[PDB]
Write a protein that binds this ligand. Structure first.
Ligand SMILES: *[C@@H]1O[C@H](CO[C@@H]2O[C@@H](C)[C@@H](O)[C@@H](O)[C@@H]2O)[C@@H](O)[C@H](O)[C@H]1NC(C)=O
Ligand code: NA
Lengths: 116, 110
């Protein structure tokens, strides 16, 4: 379990250390919220990817995956949110937010969904 | 009535020489309303294009969507390949589970 979390967080590639939570525990059947901070005063696009299979979940302003439980939104000026509307244990694992900035930032977030 | 499939020859593995442009082709039958993304399967994986849009570095990566005779060939070009471009490239279709085809690029220096 420790190996799994560390192997997720080691995938971050950033010049500015991730300012958000990078380990998120939730109970199954509740929503999960993963955050991606972008540079301020610039219009960056982001993309969220699920590492277990490599599935692209969202890219720019729109969901990419056809799994209807996922949405991306803007929480504030510089924070994007990947919203998982009903989490299940099998959603546990590593998620990556890639930003189209000059340093090609990747933030990694480990999601753990616990049994109800 | 078939689901999306990736047709031969897609995502052929290649050895290229430094400075060449390199194409990866993903031929998709029965794409329907599904979508196609190209990814560099490093660790972390890097998104190269999604649907008809190049995600970053438009002077490095180009996408030609829906070309060929049957308008079903998706072509990713990597410009001016360098040693850093070595590795695995994937074509992903957003089926569930995802449909993938991956090819490996080697780059040799003169
Ligand atoms: C390229 O891929 C080769 C085959 O490996 C499999 O597919 C890749 C994309 C990964 O998901 C890996 O876990 C699989 O075993 C590898 O043997 C080869 O080392 C890879 N090359 C590089 C440069 O990563
Ligand atoms: Na292959």
């Amino acid at each position: 379990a420790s190996e799994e979390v560390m192997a997720c967080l080691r995938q971050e590639r950033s010049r500015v250390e991730n300012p958000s939570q990078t380990i998120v525990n939730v109970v199954a059947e509740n929503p999960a919220y993963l955050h991606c901070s972008v540079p301020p005063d610039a219009e960056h696009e982001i993309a969220w990817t699920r590492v277990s299979d490599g599935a692209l979940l969202t890219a720019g302003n729109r969901t990419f995956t056809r799994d209807p439980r996922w949405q991306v939104s803007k929480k504030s000026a510089n924070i994007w949110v990947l919203n998982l509307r009903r989490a299940e244990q099998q959603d546990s694992g590593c998620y990556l937010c890639e930003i189209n900035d000059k340093h090609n930032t990747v933030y990694a977030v480990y999601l753990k969904v616990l049994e109800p | 009535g078939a689901p999306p499939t990736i047709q031969q020859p897609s995502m052929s593995s290649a050895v290229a020489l430094l400075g060449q442009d390199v194409d990866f082709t993903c031929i998709v039958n029965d794409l329907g309303s599904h979508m196609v993304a190209f990814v560099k399967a490093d660790s972390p994986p890097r998104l190269l294009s999604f649907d008809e849009k190049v995600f970053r570095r438009r002077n490095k990566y180009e996408l030609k969507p829906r070309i060929g005779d049957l308008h079903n060939e998706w072509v990713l070009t990597i410009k001016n390949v360098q040693e850093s471009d070595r590795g695995n490239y994937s074509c992903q279709i957003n089926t569930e589970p995802i449909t993938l085809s991956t090819g490996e690029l080697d780059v040799k220096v003169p």
